[PDB]
Amino acid sequence: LRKVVLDVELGREQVQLLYKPIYDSIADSNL
Amino acid sequence: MTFSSTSNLKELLRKVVLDVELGREQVQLLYKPIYDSIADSNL
């Protein structure tokens, strides 16, 4: 018979960059 | 002469029935907001 999969919601949660409002970014490859 | 004499002869008297509005209450589907439908005719 036909095979059907229960399309359930799994997978690890996405992670967000929460630090940005605090730190003052300094970007330079010369450091 | 008395109406009580002819009371039993129901076929002579006008038949009137008072409306009652009797029946069965409609049954709504309350579960719809909670569930996610998966309609497939070959499950």
Complete DSSP assignment for chain A: ----------SPPP----STTTS-----TT-
Asked if B41 is an interface residue toward chain A (Cβ–Cβ < 8 A), one would say no
Cβ partners under 8 Å of residue B20, min gap 6: none
Q: How far is B36 from chain A (nearest CA, A)?
A: 11
CA distance A19 to A25: 10
Deposited resolution, Å: 3.2
- Report residue B12 as tokens: 């002579």
User: In whole angstroms, how large is the CA radius of gyration of chain A?
Assistant: 21
Cβ partners under 8 Å of residue A7, min gap 6: B38
CA distances (Å), B39 to each of A18, B36, B43, in order?
Answer: 40, 10, 9
Phi, psi angle pair for A18, to nearest 5°? -90, -15
Report the structure determination method. Answer: cryo-EM
DSSP B6: T
Asked if A2 is an interface residue toward chain B (Cβ–Cβ < 8 A), one would say yes
Contacts of A4 in chain B (CB under 8 A): 40, 42-43
| Residues B43 and A5: beta-carbon distance below 8 Å | no
Asked if A26 is an interface residue toward chain B (Cβ–Cβ < 8 A), one would say no
How many CB atoms lie under 10 A from the CB of residue A13? Answer: 5
